[PDB]
Amino acid sequence: PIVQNLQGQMVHQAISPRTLNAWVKVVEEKAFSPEVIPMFSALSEGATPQDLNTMLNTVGGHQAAMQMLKETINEEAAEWDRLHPVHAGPIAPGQMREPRGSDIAGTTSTLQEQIGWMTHNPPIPVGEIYKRWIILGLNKIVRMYSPTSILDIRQGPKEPFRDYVDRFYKTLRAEQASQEVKNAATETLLVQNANPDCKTILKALGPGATLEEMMTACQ
Amino acid sequence: PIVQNLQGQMVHQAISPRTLNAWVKVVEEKAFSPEVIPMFSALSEGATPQDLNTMLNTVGGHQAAMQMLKETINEEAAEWDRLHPVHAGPIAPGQMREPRGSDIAGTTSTLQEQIGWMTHNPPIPVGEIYKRWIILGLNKIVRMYSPTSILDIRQGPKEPFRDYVDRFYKTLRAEQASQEVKNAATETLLVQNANPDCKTILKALGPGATLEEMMTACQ
Amino acid sequence: PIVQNLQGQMVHQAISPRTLNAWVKVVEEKAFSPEVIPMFSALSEGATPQDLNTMLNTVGGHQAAMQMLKETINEEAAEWDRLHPVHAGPIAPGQMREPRGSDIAGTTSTLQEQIGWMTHNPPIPVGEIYKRWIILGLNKIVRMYSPTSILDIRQGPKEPFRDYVDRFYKTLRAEQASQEVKNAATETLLVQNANPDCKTILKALGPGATLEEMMTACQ
């Protein structure tokens, strides 16, 4: 990653192997569950494209997911290129070539080029743009690690409301439900897909009770 | 988090992944038991709103609890807004917009805005105010990984007074009994919910014996 | 804790979560055995009252012991107040209010107030005074995690003298026997509470043999 040195300049530093191993950790337990996303972001602050690739390259297994991820990245790359036409003419000292989609993604760019862009004035944040494309990939992949389908989340005959709740919101994340959607689902589906006794209690509570009030009424 | 640099200025630094992993640790063993609270605080000294979110976002599972937490945070946000009316007019260089509830919580604010507030003179401590709202959430959630049946805590027929005591105060924490309440409960309920032999001894000790004297009289 | 920065000033730094986890470690294995005491001290050098509380608050379990500890702390607080009458009148810039027992203990004092005291010239070392009160608590608690009836430490019929010795001095620590007491106990009780064969050998050695000579005579 790029980081701030003593003299105020942003300079490059090697990715930490501790962080790569932490990333390996997460993927090894949680696979590509909704939480792999904020983690991947948290673990890659200030990363270059090379650093992002190094991280993705330590993933073992998940061959289909890696390919799906690659394909989103490549769709984002081709779009970048469409929306950014090349401007001709000679490059001045101190300046650099306009990055193509491939360069952002780190296929056609050197580490030095990546730092020059991310550190130029004004910078072109290739690491940030490429990490955006990777997160969009991750979004698509998580939807294979937690396939949507909320209508199939029903409270068991003797299942504690608490557990039914974890299974409800755990499914909403996977399908990347916005906070707005979760509010509507709570007022409706959560109530409806509950067991008979609870559904009567919840239905009795009135529309607009908070989640902590619902859990209390059906403990 | 924000921290003190050599030149005396408070500047930003990335959350440690070691701390995030430590936080993941705690939640993975203790779940949301009373101790998750002081820990969460201890692990987030000087945090920004982005840092607090990054931490909450590494929690896997507990979908119902996360939603309940979100809802408290949002109630605190809406209150903030109610008690802080917006003051119109142009923003001077060096100053910044008055934060809304959403900005405190980090939904509508950038990292730079968060640092400007927390580091301005006088600062507006968004990280502190948002961490307050999160701790209030945690309080509510622990009461789903904790029951308040102080009346149901009775000393077993052959249970050592020592163990009966851990089970008594362990229940008081969960229900967040102030230190004042604990004093009254010790003088009363602790004595009353004890086994026959001990209750006679304790009742014999007189009102006002310390906890170490009680344990001694019933060892 | 408070620590020395480059410019020579003592400034605050967040408690290390590594240290808190180390402290959790100790309590999780050794509970409140005599060794929990020097450890707690070693782990809290330069701590503020907030840091000391954060540490005590990560302890899980031991509800009776925590309450007993709280009560000593509060007795020490009330004494502090008795021996330190409040002096009236307005506070000058650069000065601060005289700490009460509650402030030392961190209930009524802010982190900033704690640093001002501990860092003022001359300082008022609230962290040191409060850590003293906590160690006195620990002393009382260890006497529920240990023994106290040295008279009950007898050498087994076929127990090696070496093991009998560890069990003898391990009990003396818990009961905080001074070095002077240990010398008298060695000359007497150690000899007397030994098995028949050893007791004759030790009694044969004469009063005044060293511990290494005793172990040699009964190997």
Add this chain to the structure above:
Amino acid sequence: PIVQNLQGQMVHQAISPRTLNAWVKVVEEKAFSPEVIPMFSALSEGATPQDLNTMLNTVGGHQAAMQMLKETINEEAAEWDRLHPVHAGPIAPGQMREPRGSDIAGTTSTLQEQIGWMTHNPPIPVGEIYKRWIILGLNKIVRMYSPTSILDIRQGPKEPFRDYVDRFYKTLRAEQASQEVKNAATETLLVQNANPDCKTILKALGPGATLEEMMTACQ
């Protein structure tokens, strides 16, 4: 490795034993699987030839692979020599001898010579050239179980398409299939080596569906 000091000069620093142990780690679990490659690179940024050898020398086991690696390195060395004829004449102060293949590889060069080259103006990046040769070795070794054995990757009778996909691309990596090849294999072999039901669905999808569409059609 060589790194940037405060005064701007690139100076030498000892390889971290933490990194060597991390490298030992990887090899001990993943052996020489496709991921050992980007890791080895990530762990050796800025390394000298001595640092690269130190790393290879901590590998236990894999005697055949180490020898195969040595042989590629030596073929690369002999080629270097072929393409770089020696230029005679006396060496000026401040300059150094032209490195031979053996020197790059670190057999005939001292640590000081390695730093002089890598740090000279213009530098001769022996550490970079030697790390290139090692990665080419690694490529050959990872194939210690290739094909083209893709024809043997068939979807099980009741195997989930997802798993069949990981096994397909996991085999493509080992055989170092370029991104171009993977695209053709996806359109063809992936479809053909799938179970009966899936193969009909995929064949129904039409040539040119993305990997995420294929997984969706056969979930």
Add this chain to the structure above:
Amino acid sequence: PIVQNLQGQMVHQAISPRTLNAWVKVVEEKAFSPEVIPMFSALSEGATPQDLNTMLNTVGGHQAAMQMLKETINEEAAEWDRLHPVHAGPIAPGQMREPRGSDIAGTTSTLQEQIGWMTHNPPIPVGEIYKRWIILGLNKIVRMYSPTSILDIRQGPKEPFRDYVDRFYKTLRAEQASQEVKNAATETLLVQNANPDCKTILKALGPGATLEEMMTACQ
């Protein structure tokens, strides 16, 4: 411990809890085996008396050994006092009181006094002198965790010479045999306490063969 800062001055730093835990580690597995000695030394470079005590105080168990250790320390203290008479008269600014045995050992001295001595010009290395006394204690204690018994180390009927050798020198360490003694024992006892076939071979080798030649002759 005391360590060298940037400005060249030796200043104090808190003992690392990582080191204390490492020390706890060693004692928890190896107890007080001959190797506890060089370790204790290695772990306490530059320590003050307070640091040495903090380390000894984290030892759990071994009550008899701790007391024996204390007694050696106290014998060394009383000797120090005998050989160093007190010199009267007022203390100049910048100077300090002559340390007594008790001060060296850290019972009667403050941390600041310890640093003043160890850092004065010329210094009085209390940490070094006290660590010497502790190592002498350790020596005595190890002789209860491995006392002695050489004549009892005989090579088994079908025991490999290699193993017989580890058991021979492992016993010599415990009994703290100097390097001079080990040489004589090798020429004699090692040969004599070997099995019949080996003893004839060794006896055949002639007096003065090295240990590697002996192992070769009896593999």
Add this chain to the structure above:
Amino acid sequence: PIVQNLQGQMVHQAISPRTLNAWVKVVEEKAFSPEVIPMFSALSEGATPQDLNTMLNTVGGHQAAMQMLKETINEEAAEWDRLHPVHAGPIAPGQMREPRGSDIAGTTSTLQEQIGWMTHNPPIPVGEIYKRWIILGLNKIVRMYSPTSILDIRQGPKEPFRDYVDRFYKTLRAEQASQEVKNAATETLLVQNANPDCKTILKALGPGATLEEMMTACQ
């Protein structure tokens, strides 16, 4: 070890306990296997003689090996002395006594003397010369757990060529075969000590096939 400070001078620094523990690690798992050698070297860059001893002294167990190591070190010491006669006469300020074998090894030399030599102009690298002698010891010791009989490495009747290869080169390392020797052994012994079917195939391949071609022909 000795290291480069900011002002350009080589000054001393305490051995890292992390490195000593890493060294303990290696010896505790791999014992004295061929890989202990490059590790020991990698872990001791820039070490003084005291640092090398501190490292050797943390080894537990292996009493016979430690003695054998000591004896090589002492043979190297006595040789040093033979080849370096003492030159008489008074020592000038700024200069130092010519080191004897014992001083190199750290028995008769102080830490300060070691630094003066290693840091003098021109230096006398006692740490380097002593580490050479230790590596020669290690070489001899590694031959205690392994066998120097390559003629005894034959491919099993149904043993996979791959495994036969690991057992061949694993034996070559132990006996420290140079890279030149390994090339000759591959062309000859590897082929000859293979099972009947493989030996015919290999013999069929012609002299001069690479190791990867041999493995392919006998998979």
